[PDB]
């Protein structure tokens, strides 16, 4: 409904110290059908997967790193925390028909690929245009897996847009962006695109795809996000 899913503001860890991120839910309860997502943000918005649905560590994800439903929470654990740690953890939920994120927990850390979604760095449109985002995937079998869609405004939150299944051509759009995202695909080249129209300044942003698919971990591999700027 109006969910919002909300996360520590800030933990200060060092290295060996165990770590309890939490992420709960304004309907009073995260249960096993959120699918919840853990990702990690670096600087540069450099965006890694560490858990999904629930409690899957994925591949490559360091073993200091678990997550599972504990009460009426979400819990990311980092059992031996490391200095490279230090970033911003994100947990995401699916309420029947969308993602939300929650505002992201900042970890300080004191004591300081095969697969690849390819994301032009930059792109300039002029208010009232539309502009095209492409996002190409290697490594991978690009139809089995959704390309989701998400964006990340200066100094805010992430939103979900939306995401495409390429082999039943199945799309599911945010009601926040149905009227401003368009989403395809191209399978011969494993292209996925999104579509910005009526644009103004407001979407000024960085836009990322990362891959999913039905009981997958959602958000594993993210694209390096295209920072648009609408101006004149």
């Known amino acids: 409904a109006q969910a919002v899913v909300t996360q520590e503001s800030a933990l200060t860890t060092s290295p060996g110290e165990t770590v309890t991120l939490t992420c709960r839910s304004s309907?009073?309860?995260?249960?096993?059908?959120?699918?919840v997502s853990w990702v990690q943000e670096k600087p540069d918005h450099l965006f890694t997967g560490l858990i999904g649905?629930?409690?899957n560590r994925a591949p490559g994800v360091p073993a200091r790193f678990s997550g599972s439903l504990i009460g009426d929470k979400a819990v990311l654990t980092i059992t031996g925390a490391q200095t490279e740690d230090e970033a911003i953890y994100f947990c995401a939920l699916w309420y029947s028909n969308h993602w939300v994120f929650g505002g992201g927990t900042k970890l300080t850390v004191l004591g300081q690929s095969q697969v690849q979604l390819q994301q032009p760095g930059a792109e300039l449109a002029k208010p009232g245009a539309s502009v095209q985002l492409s996002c190409k995937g290697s490594?991978?079998?690009?139809?089995?897996?959704?390309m989701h869609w998400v964006t990340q405004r200066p100094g805010r939150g992430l939103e979900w847009i939306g995401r495409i299944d390429p082999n039943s051509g199945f799309i599911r759009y945010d009601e926040r962006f149905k009227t401003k995202a368009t989403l395809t695909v191209d399978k011969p080249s494993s292209t996925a695109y999104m579509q910005l129209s009526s644009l103004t300044s407001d979407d000024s942003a960085v836009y990322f795809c990362?891959?999913?698919?039905?009981?997958?971990?959602?958000?594993?591999?993210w694209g390096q996000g295209t920072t648009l700027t609408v101006s004149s």
């Open positions: 649905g629930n409690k």
């Open positions: 490594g991978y079998t690009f139809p089995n897996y959704w």
């Open positions: 309907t009073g309860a995260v249960i096993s059908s959120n699918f």
């Open positions: 990362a891959r999913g698919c039905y009981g997958c971990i959602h958000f594993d591999y």
